[PDB]
Design a protein around this ligand. Structure first.
Ligand SMILES: Nc1ncnc2c1ncn2[C@@H]1O[C@H](COP(=O)(O)O)[C@@H](O)[C@H]1O
Ligand SMILES: Nc1ncnc2c1ncn2[C@@H]1O[C@H](COP(=O)(O)O)[C@@H](O)[C@H]1O
Ligand SMILES: Nc1ncnc2c1ncn2[C@@H]1O[C@H](COP(=O)(O)O)[C@@H](O)[C@H]1O
Ligand SMILES: Nc1ncnc2c1ncn2[C@@H]1O[C@H](COP(=O)(O)O)[C@@H](O)[C@H]1O
Ligand SMILES: Nc1ncnc2c1ncn2[C@@H]1O[C@H](COP(=O)(O)O)[C@@H](O)[C@H]1O
Ligand SMILES: Nc1ncnc2c1ncn2[C@@H]1O[C@H](COP(=O)(O)O)[C@@H](O)[C@H]1O
Ligand SMILES: N[C@@H](Cc1c[nH]c[nH+]1)C(=O)O
Ligand SMILES: N[C@@H](Cc1c[nH]c[nH+]1)C(=O)O
Ligand SMILES: N[C@@H](Cc1c[nH]c[nH+]1)C(=O)O
Ligand SMILES: N[C@@H](Cc1c[nH]c[nH+]1)C(=O)O
Ligand SMILES: N[C@@H](Cc1c[nH]c[nH+]1)C(=O)O
Ligand SMILES: N[C@@H](Cc1c[nH]c[nH+]1)C(=O)O
Ligand SMILES: [Mg+2]
Ligand SMILES: [Mg+2]
Ligand SMILES: [Mg+2]
Ligand SMILES: [Mg+2]
Ligand SMILES: [Mg+2]
Ligand SMILES: [Mg+2]
Ligand SMILES: [Mg+2]
Ligand SMILES: [Mg+2]
Ligand SMILES: [Mg+2]
Lengths: 295, 296, 293, 295, 289, 290
C-alpha cells in the first residue's frame, strides 16, 4: 500500500533520521510512544524500531527503506551469513551523521605494544560478529563477552579485561579510564532499501525523496555569502571566494564604483578567508543559510 | 489592565506553535515550564497560559484581549454557552496554519458501516459532546452520549461505548486501536481571536502591528527563495517552469556573458515537482533558501 | 592541556544560549560534564555558574561564559580574602540580561533606601549586596540563601530580598515589588590572565571573529522587494540598507526592479506600510546568521 | 464478565485507591501508561480514567464500582440534574483519604473579610455547580468564571476577583496571597456502585471486598501495644490503656511478679498516656502495626 | 574479594530483586553498587546478558527469569558450548507465560504453519515449533513485539504475557502457552571460596523465610473459652492456636493463629458466628518451619 | 511564628528519610514536589524545604526552630561563621540513624597531598584538617560533581563525601584518608522556645526515640518444648525475658515471644532449631520504649 521506512527508536541517530525525513518534505505528527506513524502529506509509513532489528526487516523485505548505522547493518549481515543465509539489500546513500569508530580499548594502566596484547583476554562488546571477524583475520585468540549496553564499565566491573565499542568524541572511554588502541571498523548512518523491486509508484517516491536527500547533504556545511567590494577588486575576491560556479555580480544604487558579490561557500572555508577578503576591500559581509543545494 | 493580554494553551503541540508564532511576531518572552503568567520583556504584552477548554470563555467574557485556540474548542464552547441561553461573541482575527485536525465518528474495524444510520442507538464516547450533539440532531440520529475527557480511543475496547467521535490528524491513533474513521463532522485549525468589546486605541494599535507580522508569517509558510544559474537563451523556458511571485530576478555572473543567475520565490513542493525539468533546460547550482515573512 | 578549555554553565537559559553560541561559532559537539568537540581541539566543561570565575582566576580553564553578576560577586569574595583575582574580558554578550534588585512585600511602604535600615535581607549575592549597602550607609542583616530567594519573606526568613529580575513575573508571583536596582548584568566571555600558547590564542582569535559576526547580525534581516524604478530614491530614503540598496533587473520588465537591503527587523516593520505606499510589492524577509563590517 | 472498577488516572487519590485495592487482596500490575488493567488473581478489571469522568460512567451503569472524591461526584450529579437527567448510584463507603474543603478565598487584605464581601464579584472555580448552589442558597449574586485548573492564579491573572477551590493544607492559598474565608463543601474519597443490580456473582465479590475495606478502615491509626508491668499494677495500667475490650495478660519466663500486657490503642491516645504508663511501672513498651481490625 | 550478584537493570523484576535483597539484610543505595553493610557487590545489567555472566563464572549469583536463562542456555548449546550453573531457588515473582498469539479473528497449532512469527525468544520458539513439527518464518524483534502484526512485520507473535492487558490492547488472542517462567536465583558452577559460600548460605536461609511468609498473617481474636474447638477447626494455626488469658476474665480468651490471608477472609464470618470478636490481622515478615 | 518551624533538605536521600521520620512521629503533611513551605494538617507545624547548605544559618540566626541536617554541613557552616567572627550556636537534640557518610581525601588510582590542588565542596572542613596535620595545599571550591575534577584537570585530588564508594570507583579514584564522619542530626535553635512549642518538641522527641530504638529490632515468636525454655532463653533472651504462652490442648510445648535485633536472630536461628524451636515468626516493631 504505502512506502514503509524503518528508523531507530532512540539515540541521536533517531533524532537526525526524523529531521532528515522532515527536510525531505515528509510531514508526520508523531507521539513520543507511537511506534507506527503515518505521514499526513505523503503515502509513507514510518516504523520506529530498535536499531538491531532494522537490518533483518530489510533483509526479509518486510519494510522498504531503513536508516541504520553501517556497523549495525554489517554486524547483522555477518550473523545471518554465519547461519548459512544470503542477506541482501541496496545501499542508497551513505549519510552525513551517525559517525563513529568501533575500537578495541584497554584500561589506561595496561601496557599496549601491539595486537598480541589482546591474546587470551576477555573482551566485552555489543558487536560480537564484527569483533570475531577482526580477531580471526589477525589470528588473535580471545574470550568473547557479549553485553548489550554499558560496555565501557566491563573492565572496572571485572566482567572483561578489555572492550570493543563505539567511539565518537572519546569522552566515554576517558570517563572510564580506557585508552582507544585499535580501530576495527568505521561507520556512519546509511539509507538502505530492500532487494526485491518495489512497485513503480513506490520506487518513484523513493526517487523523489533521494533527490531531496542529495539536496540536503550538498547544502549541509554551506552558506550563501554576500558582500560589497570595489569593481576593480572582482578578480582578487573571486580568487579567494570563488562560489560554486562563479560569483553573482549585482549593481548598487547610484554607485558605479562598487558592486555586491554573492558566492556559495563552505562556512569554515569562508571564515578562513574572511580577513583576506577585508584586506581586498570587502565590506558588509553577510552569511545566510542554504537549506538545499543541487549542483 | 495596562498591557495587552493574550491567552494561549498550556500544553500540546498547539501551545509550542503559539509561542513560536508570537516569537516570530517580535514578542520576546521567557516562559518557564511552570510560569502561568509571563510578561513580554520588549512589548507591553502579558501571556496567560491556560487549559485550552477555558480560553473561549475568557474571550467571551472579555477578561483577556486575544486568544489562540482550536476552532473545535472555540465552537464547542460557543455551543455550550448558547445552549444555556447566552450570546457569546468574539472577533475572528485569523485562521492560522497549524493545529489542523478532523473531528470524526469512528467504529471498531470489525463493525459493518453502510451509512450514518449504523450509529442509531449507539453509545458514542467523545470529548466534544456539543459538536457531536449538533451533528446527530441535524441528521436525526438517536444515540447515547458518553463524555470522556481523554483517551477517547480506548472507550470501545474498554466497553464504555460502541463508537467514538474524536480528533484525527494522521490517523495513527485510530489504527492503533483497531478503529475505522467513518464520517468527518468538523474540520479545525488554530485561530487567533479577540474579545468583542473595543480595546483602547493603544492596545488596538499593537494588535494591528502584530497582525501585519502574522500575515507575513502565514504568507511565507511553505515558500522558499530559489536561486539558480542558467544560459541566457533559456530564460523564457525557465520562467515558464518557475515564474516567481511576479517575475524572475535576473543577475549577472562574473566574466560571463552567456549565463545568468535567476531568482524566484516558489512554493517548495512546486519547486521539487519542476526541478528535473529545470535541469533539462540547463539550470545548475540550484539553491533553496528560507523565507521568514512575505508581504504581497 | 593539549586542547583549548572552555567552561560553561551546567544549567539555566544561560547554559542553552552558551551551547548555541559555540555551535554558531563552528564548534561541533554532542553534550556529560566534560565534552570534546569533534571538529576542533576544544574541550567544554559544564560546571555550576558560581564555580566558573574561580577556575578562570586560577588559570585552570582557558575561557568561560558567565554572568557579569556571578563574576563580580566572586571577584569581590576573593578580594575580601586578600587575593588579586584577574582575567581578560573578551566580550560582553547579548544574552543573560538581568537586574539584581532589592524588593519588598507589596504591602510594605517604600519611600527611601532608608526603609531597608535594619531589615533582614535574603540574597544569593551577599558580596554585591554588602558593597551596595556599605556605599549607601544602610545597616542590614544578611541572610544567604542559595535558591528560591523570592519565598524568604513569606517563609519569614527575611523582611526583604535582593535577587535577579528579568521579566518581573517571579516577583509578582510572590507579591513582591522591585524597589531599587543595584547591579545590571548580562553574559560575558572571559579568558584567564596567563598567556595562552600561540596555537590556543590563534583559535580564540578565530572564535572571536565569529562571535562578533553572530552579535552584529542579531535582529537584522535581509529584505527584498520589487518597486518601480522611478521610486528608487524614495524607497532608499525609507530603507537605506547597511550601505546602499542592491538593484536588480526583472525579467521582461523595464519599469520595475528588485531592491535588496539589510535592515534591523523592527525598523523594517515600522516602515513597511510607507514602502507599500511608495509602490513596493513582493516584500521578503530573510534571515542573516552573521554580519561583518 | 468481570467486575469493573473505575479509579482516578492521577493524583494522590489515584495512589491511595490502588493501595486500598491491593490491601483488599486485588493483585494487579498497572503500567504507567496502561488504561485498562486486569487483576491477575480475581475477576476484576480496573479502569484508570480522569476523575471528572468517573461519576458519569457510574451514573450510566457502564462500570460497576468507582472511587472518587465526593466533590467531583456531587458536582457531576448537579450538572446531570441540570440537564434533566436522574443520575443515581449507591454509596458503599466514605473512605479514609482524599480529604479537602471546597472554600471561597480572596486576596489577603489587612482587614477581616467575610461572605458578604463576595456580592457582585467574579469568582473563578472548577466546581461551578457546587458554587452556584451555595451562592443561591445564601442569596449572593456573583459572576461565574469556570477554569479547569490553576484556579489559585486567577486573581493575580486578573481573570476573577476571588476563587472557590479545594484546600487541604492551605499552602497553595498562602503561596498565592489568598485568604480562606468560607468553607462551602467538605469532601473525602468515596466508594460507589452503579444503581442497577449486579449479577449474584459480582455482588458477592463486592460484598467480600467491602468486608476487607471495613477491616482496613477500622485499623487505620490503631496499633498493637505490648508492655511489661508488675502484676500489682494491672488495674492502674488497664485504666490508662484499656484495649479494644480488655488487656491480654501473658506470663513471663521464671517471673511471678511481672506480666506482659497487650492492648490495641489508637496511636495518638497511646502517646498521650505513655508517660503515665511509665509512672505506673510499664517497661519495654512496643508499638506494632495492625493491618485490619474487625469488631 | 566480595560476593558478586547480577540483577536486572529495569522492569518489575529489577525492583522485586532489590526488595528481596533488602529483606535478606543487604543494605545498598549506578551500574555497580556496593552494599554498605555486607561484602557484596550488585551489578545491574540487561537481563539477556546475565546468564552468560553466570555461565562464564564472572559473577557469583544472578536473579533472572527462567525464560531468559533457558533462551541463553539454548543459544550457547546451539554454538557447541556446555553452559552450566546451580539453581538455588525458584522465586515467587516474575511470573509470565511465553505464548503464541494471533490477531483476534485458530483451531490448532497447524494454523501457525508457514506464518512469520515475531519474538524476542527465537531459541525457545524454535525448539517448540521443531518439537511440534510446525514450519514457520522467524522474525526477531528486541521489543514491542506486540505491534508486529499491526505493523505488518509478522502474522503472529510469541511473547510474554502476565495479565493479558497488552495482548488485548493490540487486538491479539493468546492461543498457546509454550513456556512458563518465574524469577530464579542462580549461582555459577565453579565452587566459591568458603567465605563467599558461607554468605550465600546465610542469604538463602533468609530467602526461605521471606518466601514462606508470603501471603501469611498473624491473626488475633477474642472468643469464649467454650468455643475454642469450633474456632480451632475453622482457623487451626500453623501448629495449634496460642491461648492467652484476658484481664479479670475467666469466660473468654485471646486466640492467636498464623493463617494465609485469603483463607482467613474466607472463614471470617464463620468465626464471628462462633463468637469471635476484636479480630486483628498483623503482618509476618519471615516464617521458618 | 504561631507554629513550630522545621527546616529539612529540599533533595537527596536525606530529604526522603527526613520526611519519613516526621511521618512516623505523627506529623501529617502533603509535600508536593514544588511546595517549599508545607503546613502539617494535624499539628501546628510548618515544614520548610531548603537547600542543605542554607539550613545551619537559619538555625544559627534563630529564624527556624528545628532542623534536620548532616553533621558535615552543620560543622562546615559553623566553621565558616566562626571564621567571620560570629559565635553560632544551637542545641543538638539527636544524632539520627541515616545520612551516614565519610568526608575523605581521594586521589587518582597523606604526605603526598603536599602542594596539591584539592577540589572540595567543604573547604572549611578540609582547611582545618590540613592545618592540623601541617600539610600545604591549594584549595579549589566546587559546588558539585567534585569527583570529576581530577579527570577535568581542575585539581590533583579531591575531598568529598563517600557512602558506598561507588562514585570514587566510577571515577578511578582511591579513598586515601577519612577526615570527617557524618550522619543526619536533629538540631534546635539556641534561644528558648515558647512553652507550647517546646512541649511539642518534647512530644516529637519521645517518638523519635521510639523509632530509633526499634530500628533493626523485630518481634520473634516460636514454639518450643517446655523443657527447652532455659536453653532457648539463653540463645534468645528478649529485651527483658521471654513471654511464655500456652498452646491449645498441649501441655508439652509453649509459644515463646522475644524482641531481638534481627541480625542477632539470624545468627542464632539454627541453634534455636537444634533446641527444638519451630514455626518461627519475625514480625515488625515500629517503636520501642525502655
Ligand atoms: N553511532 C552510534 N550508535 C550507537 N552508539 C553510539 C554511536 N556513537 C557513539 N555511541 C556511543 O555513545 C556514547 C558517546 O560516545 P563518545 O562521544 O565517544 O563518548 C558512547 O557510549 C558510545 O559508545
Ligand atoms: N488539535 C488537536 N487537539 C487536541 N488533540 C489532538 C489534536 N490533533 C490530534 N489530537 C489528538 O492526537 C491523536 C490523534 O492524532 P493522530 O494519531 O495523528 O490522528 C488523538 O489522541 C487526538 O485526540
Ligand atoms: N540571568 C539569570 N541568571 C540566573 N537566574 C535568573 C536570571 N534571570 C532571571 N533569573 C531568575 O529566573 C526567574 C525568572 O525571572 P523573571 O523573568 O524575573 O520571573 C527568577 O527566579 C530570577 O531570579
Ligand atoms: N482532593 C483533591 N482533589 C484535587 N485537588 C486537590 C485535592 N485536595 C487538594 N487539592 C489541590 O491540591 C493543591 C494542594 O492543596 P493544599 O494542601 O491546600 O496546598 C491545591 O491546588 C488544592 O486545590
Ligand atoms: N518477566 C518479564 N520480562 C519481560 N517482560 C515482561 C515480563 N512479564 C511481562 N512482561 C511484558 O510486560 C507487558 C505487560 O504484560 P501483561 O500484564 O500481559 O500486559 C507485556 O509487554 C509483557 O510482554
Ligand atoms: N549525606 C550526603 N550528602 C550529600 N551528598 C552525599 C551524601 N552521601 C553521599 N553523597 C554523595 O552521593 C554520591 C553517592 O555516594 P557513593 O554511595 O559513595 O557513591 C556521591 O557523589 C557522594 O558524594
Ligand atoms: N553565483 C554564486 C551564488 C549562486 C549559486 N547559485 C545561484 N547563485 C555561486 O556560484 O556560488
Ligand atoms: N523576482 C522574484 C524574486 C523576488 C520576490 N521579491 C523580491 N524578489 C519573484 O518575483 O519571485
Ligand atoms: N546592498 C544591501 C544588501 C547587502 C549588504 N551586503 C551585501 N548586500 C545593503 O547595503 O544593505
Ligand atoms: N486484648 C487486647 C488485644 C487484642 C484484641 N484482639 C486480640 N487481642 C485488646 O482488647 O485490645
Ligand atoms: N500458635 C499459633 C501462632 C504461632 C506460630 N508461631 C508462634 N506462634 C500457630 O500455630 O499458628
Ligand atoms: N517478653 C519479651 C517480648 C516483649 C517485650 N515487650 C513486651 N513483650 C521480651 O522481653 O523481649
Ligand atoms: Mg541481534
Ligand atoms: Mg468546558
Ligand atoms: Mg561561592
Ligand atoms: Mg530560583
Ligand atoms: Mg537576524
Ligand atoms: Mg465535566
Ligand atoms: Mg494545580
Ligand atoms: Mg542475547
Ligand atoms: Mg555556603
Amino acid at each position: 500500500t504505502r512506502l514503509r521506512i524503518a528508523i531507530q527508536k532512540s539515540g541521536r541517530l533517531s533524532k537526525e533520521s526524523i529531521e532528515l525525513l522532515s527536510e525531505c518534505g515528509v510531514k508526520m505528527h508523531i507521539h513520543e510512544q507511537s511506534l507506527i506513524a503515518f505521514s499526513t502529506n505523503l503515502p509513507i509509513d514510518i516504523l520506529r524500531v530498535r536499531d538491531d532489528d532494522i537490518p533483518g526487516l530489510i533483509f526479509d523485505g518486510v519494510v522498504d527503506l531503513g536508516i541504520i548505522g553501517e556497523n549495525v547493518l554489517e554486524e547483522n549481515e555477518l550473523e545471518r551469513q554465519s547461519l548459512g543465509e544470503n542477506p541482501s539489500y541496496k545501499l542508497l546513500k551513505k549519510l552525513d551523521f551517525g559517525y563513529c569508530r568501533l575500537s578495541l580499548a584497554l584500561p589506561q594502566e595496561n601496557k599496549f605494544q601491539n595486537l598480541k596484547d589482546f591474546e587470551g583476554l576477555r573482551i566485552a562488546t555489543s558487536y560480537p560478529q564484527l569483533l570475531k571477524r577482526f580477531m580471526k583475520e589477525n589470528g588473535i585468540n580471545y574470550k568473547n563477552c557479549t553485553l548489550t549496553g554499558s560496555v565501557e564499565v566491563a573492565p572496572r566491573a571485572n566482567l572483561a579485561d578489555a572492550i570493543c565499542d563505539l567511539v565518537s568524541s572519546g569522552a566515554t572511554l576517558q570517563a572510564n579510564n580506557l585508552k582507544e588502541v585499535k580501530v576495527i571498523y568505521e561507520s556512519r548512518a546509511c539509507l538502505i532499501q530492500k532487494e526485491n523491486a518495489l512497485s513503480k509508484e513506490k520506487q518513484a517516491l523513493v526517487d523523489k525523496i533521494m533527490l531531496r536527500v542529495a539536496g540536503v547533504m550538498q547544502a549541509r556545511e554551506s552558506k550563501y555569502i554576500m558582500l560589497h567590494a570595489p569593481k576593480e577588486k572582482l578578480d582578487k575576491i573571486q580568487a579567494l571566494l570563488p562560489g560554486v560556479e562563479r560569483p553573482t555580480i549585482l549593481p548598487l544604487a547610484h554607485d558605479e564604483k562598487n558592486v555586491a558579490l554573492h558566492m556559495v561557500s563552505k562556512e569554515n572555508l569562508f571564515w578562513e578567508t574572511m580577513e583576506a577578503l577585508k584586506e581586498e576591500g570587502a565590506s558588509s559581509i553577510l552569511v545566510l543559510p542554504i537549506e538545499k543545494m543541487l549542483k
